[PDB]
């Protein structure tokens, strides 16, 4: 059966709908840009990372948003006990408080963790760490994911390198992603709202998805969007 949908928001021409019923959820069909932030090889001096350095800002003391900075405004460089020594520490809005601000281990590794981005000022009740079910209507592929990063308020439809892989979307931070509105994201706001191990949040996403009616329901719903 088709679901009953109620508009709650709109960003960049994409309508965001509350899905009537329980558990509480919202859904949107959008493109999928790559967010490599949090990957410990995303950014390095002299374009050494998997993204161009300037995608994180200016790494010579100017405005740098890709990750934490030192007392003089330069990006923190990874140490010998970090995954990519000498690369910059790239940050995500969601974080693990077990690690310090200057540690790559504090952030969500885009290479390994399926995560979605929501636009700033458009979380629609979701809190970082909440879970989601993500579906690619062109490949038939799906994955559970967390709300792991915050994007520009004027853009919607973006997620991690690993989520791209799971959806069979080109995962390259420089030329990957898609502008085609082929990804359906079902967010469960209020579902977690904290950092926890991937095994735990993935199990919780699985339990909510079962209770909500499974992928079969989301597949039918996707035809309405
Ligand atoms: N490349 C830009 C960039 O703006 C954006 O990157 C993310 O921007 C977030 C802004 O909210 C930022 O969140 C902050 O992260 C730190 C560390 O946890 C916190 O202290 C702050 O409270 C957060 N506001 C992310 O770290 C950052 N990855 C990118 C995302 O795709 O899209 C472009 O706009």
Residue numbers in the entry: 0 to 224
From the paper:
We focus on AMGs that potentially encode chitosanase enzymes that metabolize chitin – a common carbon polymer. One expressed protein showing endo-chitosanase activity (V-Csn) is crystalized and structurally characterized at ultra-high resolution, thus representing the structure of a soil viral AMG product. The structure consisted of two non-contiguous structural domains. Our rigorous analyses not only resulted in a crystal structure of a soil viral AMG product, but also enabled us to propose the mode of action of this previously uncharacterized chitosanase enzyme in the GH75 family of glycosyl hydrolases.
Co-crystallization of both mutant proteins with chitohexaose (a β-(1-4)-linked polymer of six D-glucosamine (GlcN) residues) gave a complex with the E157Q mutant only. The substrate was located in the interdomain cleft, with three of the six GlcN residues (hereinafter named GlcN-1, GlcN-2 and GlcN-3) visible in Fo-Fc electron density, oriented such that GlcN-1 is the reducing end. The GlcN-2 and GlcN-3 residues are in a standard chair conformation, however, the density for the first observed residue (GlcN-1) suggested a distorted boat conformation. The GlcN-1 residue is anchored by a single hydrogen bond between the O6 atom and the side chain of Q157. The central GlcN residue (GlcN-2) makes hydrogen bonding interactions with the side chains of D148 and D36 via its free amine, along with a third to the backbone carbonyl oxygen of A90 from Domain-2. The GlcN-3 residue makes a hydrogen bonding interaction with the carbonyl oxygen of T91 via the O6 atom, and another to a water molecule. Although some additional Fo-Fc density was observed at the non-reducing end of GlcN-3 (the O4 atom), the sparsity of the density did not allow for a fourth GlcN to be modelled. The location of the trisaccharide fragment and the interactions it makes with the protein suggests that residues D36 and D148 form the −2 subsite and play a key role in binding and orienting the substrate (in this case via the GlcN-2 residue). The E157 residue represents the −1 subsite and may serve as the nucleophilic group responsible for bond cleavage, assuming that hydrolysis occurred at the reducing end of GlcN-1. A loop in V-Csn Domain-2 (residues Ala90 and Thr91) is involved in formation of the −2 and −3 subsites and would be expected to correctly orient this end of the chitosan substrate for optimal positioning of the −1/+1 cleavage site.
